[PDB]
Design a protein around this nucleic acid. Structure first.
Ligand SMILES: Nc1ncnc2c1ncn2[C@@H]1O[C@H](COP(=O)(O)OP(=O)(O)OP(=O)(O)O)[C@@H](O)[C@H]1O
Ligand SMILES: Nc1ncnc2c1ncn2[C@@H]1O[C@H](COP(=O)(O)OP(=O)(O)OP(=O)(O)O)[C@@H](O)[C@H]1O
Lengths: 788, 788
DNA sequence: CTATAGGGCGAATTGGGTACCG
DNA sequence: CGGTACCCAATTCGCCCTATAG
């Protein structure tokens, strides 16, 4: 029974209706007492997801008001439930003091919790980076921006066309994606989690030019080389405004912008990245991954940087030569380095929470702790003789004065909430300890009087205690509550007792609660000053974290290299991969049986290898080993081979395993070049066998006559093995399974040629078919090959 | 630690050591209170599997004794755990009262719980038959015996050689298998669950001749035509003795022996069975099965008989013509038949438990209930005019006197255990009701006194109750346990009260528990008499169950026929299958879009059909449709086609898919004849395309030149399409997927010829490869078919 | 005696109670 | 003033646990 004109509503709902009207397409948490109350349609959705009982707010006005509510202290739990569902939610809070506000207390939206801007640790998987991005389409191309709000890392790109958008979208995997109403290609956008449609006026170039310059404080974006790419800047502006709108505050940690160049990275198509199983397998699990066997790192920061480095393999040689020399020098001390680096903690996400002024003292404990670990690191690092190691040593800095300030201004092990205090250490603010002296004077007076009044009145059941609602009392049991002096003022009546107050206790109760509130407000006001003291050096702290986890990677890649006997690979100028004693990493790390290793050669000349041989012969594992070495070479780490020599590579194509097969193949033969490594796993195997033949036969010839890429074709066809006689670049290689007696063995060893008579003609003799039938095959096997 | 000679042990362990010595190769459950205590090596194995804590019993003997124990009431749970692992276990009990043995109470093995003889319903999957078998090898041949202890159905066979042993072993799937120490072929035996080695003297012919005759009560086994097959009889004898030994009692339900003739059944090889997904899919589940679609049977017995019928398709025409006419006549009344037949219950397993004297009253409820449903069945069946229906009506019988006895001697809804009584109804034994009168006098006296003593003492918290260990008490709360009269004798010191006894209550508690034990022992003694009353007619009851579930099948098939439009198929004398509007049963029951139906013809002449065409085009499902029709023709049911004409069939060979492929192919081409239906599916799958070609090409030619069987070859190879020009009997059939514009359709329609241009050359244009690459395929697709 | 197995001893807690509140 | 935020308290349920005598 609801009429809802502006006037008809009560002053509290009039205030909410305007606040909800600002953000009407998203849910709101509205502070009231100790509960965030939801109303009408919002109360309905909340009841479905949060599974909280849908109730109705009392209709004093007249109109029905569907209502739901959740406790303020447990908000984060429900926020997590909503964030998994990709539900955007606004948080609004009482800004003014309700006593001084005659009308409804001044409420304002404090933050907008979106899947992109979740900076709260509870909502962030520790070894996964959370990202926020928007996307724009012009007739020529697309403007894709990204911001790691949890780090301040801000990126941008102008990818050429639709297929590269998908590669970028999977590689980023943005838990939240903003876009514009005019976006034409709606296949790519639909199905993405936390999908947001936006107004067109937000993607204006002029607004972006000014906004980006204002946030950085630099007059020209020329300082970061982004000026010459306006399409991407537009998305940045909306993202920066969206981030600003969602956090309602300045973002000074976001101090820079960078252009992710296609030229400066290996372009892996989305599909190739599903087959490599870099961090996530085909099944969607985190088992049998390159990451798991390459990852034994101490800090989550280090794992993320590793996962980023894997997704973004770098192409410049200088950066690789710098890293290898460092890892080689660290190898000896790894034993002493790994333990100290573990107590560093999540500095990157800590600094960002500090930047947003939303860091909590348990984070400040990890910060001072990391500050304590730095000097011993500097000591162990000083003895090391290599140029980048001393550079990394300088970059961590000292921050010793800040550590002293923290040790002076925080206790050793702090609580999670500032609301109850006991955070700041004793001797920093003499006034703090003056107010805490009255708090510690609670212990003695209460018991001292509890014995004093017990001695005076002569009542042995006399107990002094504190009730949150009734303040400080004296509890005389019902058996003695008639011998209580006239002085003892009745305060509360109980089941088995009676509670009394005197002006002396009331005077103590007044001074203690006031001194408490004085102590706590001072603690909060100083807790703000801690941010004010440390904010100046935030740029240097952000440089410190950018080196610490940049060291964690270099120490693990040394521990793994020493443990798995990996060797550093030299970079050469010509595209071409030469491997000696090659061992696939993931298999040789989950197999009781030893991995028989195999050398591989790829060159301007050894570009194409046809792989044949029996099923269950691991025809597949031989190729995955090359691609993963080629990837590891360009992350700058060592390789599980005696020696690897790598040539520069622009793109890695792969289709492990019809409609889906031709799409990714068509994609490769249009976008592959001379610097491309292609890895066909099965090809021309759709049906018929005279149809798939006319597909793959041509596919390889085009991959080795024009694209001139490198390929490790795995083909069941025995007719694609005549390519070397017809085409230059191709070379047959075969994985042979041996047969002694009635047992087949899996050698997974790689050699030259392939076998006309198959192990099948011999397998036919094992559990033998009638002798005429096996003879009849021999007659036909001879006939097929001979006529050809 | 001490000497372990016979004397050194304590009297209890001396008794156990001799008992264990009788059965030392199997575990024992030794009755020692609820916990059947297990010792030494047994305690070790128990701790590993039952996951019960391995402890050590005190060394009274002087040597440390390891020990485990499990409660008697929860034995069945641990028995199930052991049965799944195939672990045989003996159950021993204190049979003689403590007086029978001066030392430890007489203890005898009551039963040997083996995976074969599990008659307990809890250990039997309701819709799966449990079996028990032995196998001994002789120079002449193998003797394979089987006993369905849960039914009394006892079979025997003398299979020729090894390959048929495996087919029989899988078809039976004996949860347990017994064999002889001299057994040569140990590949077949190893890997089977609950594997048992036995002494040689058990497989003597003379002992078997006498033992089988003694059990049947027939002077000559000539009464069942088994005399002329001694090898099989030997295994029977051991099995009969093993069954006898395992149950320690007579087996009068096992009243007959039968020789399973290869001639009188369709011989399905083990492998074929796993592919047609008859009861169990490739994945091992019970979903998407012929069973799942053909099984809405109203009693599990009916599903088992269906599954048996499926697993043993019958060959004699008379039995089929009998069944079809019956199902056709039943079709009209199916609506009225299905509900009444549901209340029948598991009569077959019930009668066997009754026979073993191990039936439980919950089973007797289903028996009397089925007896009540018979007259209304006889009424509905009387109006039906067909010869076998009236014959089936006679076979169920009346058993009206037994129903009257059961209605007089069992209550409506009985409990599971006889241990607590309340089973037998009131008016049968006047002495029972005399003892039950004291039991029903428990309700009034307890509450009458509870108020009487409450009125006398003046204590309002006075409660009269019964604790199993402390007997009958009076509970006075701790607040009033000091006002309790001196008469009230303290019994139990409760945590919040005190429990008292007086001689009046004790006198009542004595007379009630004695009268209980008198009532209960009488209930058990009469519960024996129930078996003694029904045992004479057990042969007729076993004939009744053999018709009831044999009716459930004939009504379920009629229902599923009316619903899915199944039509009766005529039998012809020449082997050959003609199908019109053929509809595969499972897919048209799990597929949203319409299953398109398709006709098929198989004859002395149309014996071979090569199936080609696109992948995801049902190259495979159309062949599975024919085999399942051919099977369902020889179970005697209707078929999901307008009309089916079937010719007699001896064997259904089916390979659906290297080492494993050639074994079952070899097996077919040795054991296939003129009456064989073969379904090579994806054959010639040699990983080398050239290799597999030489294999299947010859396989088909041999299947159509000498074996002269019927085949539905599903082949990806497009070279096997030239057979009709080379070989008579072969005929190409193709399932075409259409391509109009940029959409591919799944017609699932069967026509003549094959598609030379494949959907792939068109699919290449969709999500198009470079125009040169698609052109290059055309060039090659033309080249491959033209050269041929 | 030496084991388990029903009995002893807490122990969390959830559906009401109880004001209450701008 | 119509729910609503805060407040229990006597349990049913979970976890020990401690007996003595053929
Ligand atoms: N170097 C090696 N040494 C020992 N075992 C190996 C080696 N490489 C692989 N294997 C094992 O042998 C198995 C071969 O089976 P797999 O299915 O991978 O064969 P495949 O020929 O790659 O199959 P497909 O032809 O379907 O791609 C692997 O799964 C792995 O367990
Ligand atoms: N009669 C039908 N009409 C329409 N769709 C069908 C029909 N039968 C099956 N389908 C659907 O089309 C799919 C075709 O795949 P299916 O596995 O049957 O192909 P197949 O050629 O038998 O495969 P394979 O050659 O690998 O054995 C089925 O999975 C099902 O979803």
């Amino acid at each position: 029974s609801a009429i809802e004109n502006f006037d008809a509503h009560t002053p509290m709902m009039q205030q909410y209706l305007r606040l909800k009207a600002q953000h009407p397409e998203i849910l709101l948490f509205y502070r009231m007492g100790d509960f965030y109350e939801l109303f009408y349609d919002d109360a309905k959705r909340a009841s479905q997801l949060l599974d909280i009982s849908l109730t109705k707010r009392g209709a004093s006005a007249g109109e029905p008001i569907p209502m739901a509510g959740i406790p303020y202290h447990a908000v984060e739990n429900y926020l997590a439930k909503l964030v998994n569902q990709g539900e955007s939610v606004a948080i609004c809070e009482q800004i003014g003091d309700p006593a001084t506000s005659k009308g409804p207390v001044e409420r304002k939206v404090v933050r907008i919790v979106t899947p992109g801007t979740i900076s709260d640790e509870a909502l962030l998987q520790e070894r996964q980076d959370n990202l926020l991005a928007a996307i724009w389409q012009d007739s020529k191309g697309f403007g894709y921006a990204t911001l790691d709000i949890s780090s301040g890392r801000f990126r941008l790109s102008e990818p050429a066309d639709r297929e590269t958008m998908a590669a970028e979208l999977q590689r980023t995997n943005p838990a939240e994606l903003l876009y514009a109403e005019d976006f034409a290609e709606m296949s790519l956008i639909e199905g993405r989690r936390g999908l947001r449609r936006r107004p067109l006026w937000e993607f204006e170039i002029d607004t972006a030019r000014q906004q980006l310059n204002l946030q950085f404080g630099t007059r020209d974006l020329v300082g970061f080389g982004v000026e010459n790419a306006p399409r991407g800047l537009c998305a940045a502006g909306c993202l920066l405004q969206y981030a600003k709108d969602t956090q309602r505050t300045t973002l000074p940690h976001i101090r820079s912008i960078t252009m992710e160049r296609e030229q400066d990275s290996i372009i892996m198509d989305a599909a190739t990245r599903r087959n490599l199983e870099i961090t996530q397998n085909l099944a969607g699990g985190a088992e049998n991954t390159l990451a798991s066997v390459l990852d034994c790192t101490v800090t989550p920061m280090g794992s993320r940087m590793l996962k980023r480095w894997l997704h973004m393999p770098v192409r410049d040689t200088r950066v690789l030569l710098e890293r290898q020399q460092t890892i080689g020098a660290l190898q000896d001390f790894t034993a002493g380095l790994q333990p100290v680096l573990r107590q560093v903690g999540d500095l990157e996400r800590i600094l960002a929470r500090l930047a947003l002024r939303t860091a909590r003292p348990r984070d400040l404990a990890r910060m001072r702790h990391a500050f304590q670990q730095l000097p011993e690191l500097r000591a162990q690092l000083e003895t090391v003789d290599s140029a980048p190691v001393q550079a990394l040593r300088e970059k961590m800095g000292e921050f010793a004065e800040l550590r002293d300030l923290l040790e002076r201004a925080i206790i050793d092990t702090p609580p999670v909430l500032v609301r109850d205090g006991g955070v700041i250490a004793s001797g920093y603010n003499e006034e703090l300890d003056e107010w805490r002296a009255l708090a510690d004077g609670a212990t003695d007076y209460l018991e001292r009087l509890e014995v004093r009044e017990r001695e005076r009145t002569g009542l042995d059941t006399l107990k002094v205690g504190f009730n949150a609602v009734h303040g400080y009392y004296i509890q005389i049991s019902r058996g003695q509550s008639h011998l209580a002096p006239i002085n003892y003022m009745r305060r509360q009546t109980l089941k088995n007792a009676e509670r009394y107050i005197i002006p002396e206790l009331k005077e103590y109760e007044d001074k203690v609660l006031t001194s408490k509130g004085k102590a706590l407000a001072l603690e909060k006001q100083l807790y703000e000053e801690l941010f004010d003291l440390l904010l100046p050096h935030l740029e240097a702290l952000q440089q410190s974290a950018s080196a610490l986890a940049e060291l964690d990677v270099l120490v693990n890649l040394a521990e793994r290299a020493y443990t798995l006997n990996y060797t550093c690979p030299t970079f050469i100028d010509k595209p071409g991969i030469r491997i000696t004693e090659g061992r696939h990493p993931v298999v040789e790390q989950v197999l009781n049986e030893p991995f028989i290793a195999n050398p591989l050669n790829l060159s301007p000349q050894r570009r194409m290898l046809i792989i044949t041989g029996p099923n269950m012969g691991g025809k597949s594992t031989y190729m995955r080993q090359t691609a993963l070495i080629a990837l590891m070479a360009y992350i700058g780490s060592y390789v599980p081979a005696q020696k690897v020599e790598i040539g520069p590579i622009d793109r890695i194509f792969t289709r492990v395993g019809f409609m889906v097969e031709m799409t990714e193949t068509a994609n490769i033969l249009h976008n592959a070049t001379e610097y491309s490594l292609v890895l066909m796993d099965e090809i021309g195997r759709g049906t018929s066998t005279y149809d798939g033949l006319s597909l793959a036969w041509a596919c390889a010839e085009n991959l080795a006559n024009k694209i001139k890429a490198l390929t490790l074709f795995a083909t069941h066809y025995f007719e694609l093995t005549q390519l070397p006689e017809k085409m230059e670049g191709v070379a047959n290689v075969h994985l042979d399974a041996l047969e002694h007696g009635d047992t087949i063995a899996f050698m997974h060893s790689v050699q030259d040629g392939a076998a006309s008579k198959s192990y099948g003609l011999a397998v036919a003799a094992l559990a033998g078919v009638p002798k005429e039938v096996i003879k009849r095959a021999r007659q036909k096997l001879r006939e097929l090959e001979s006529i050809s």
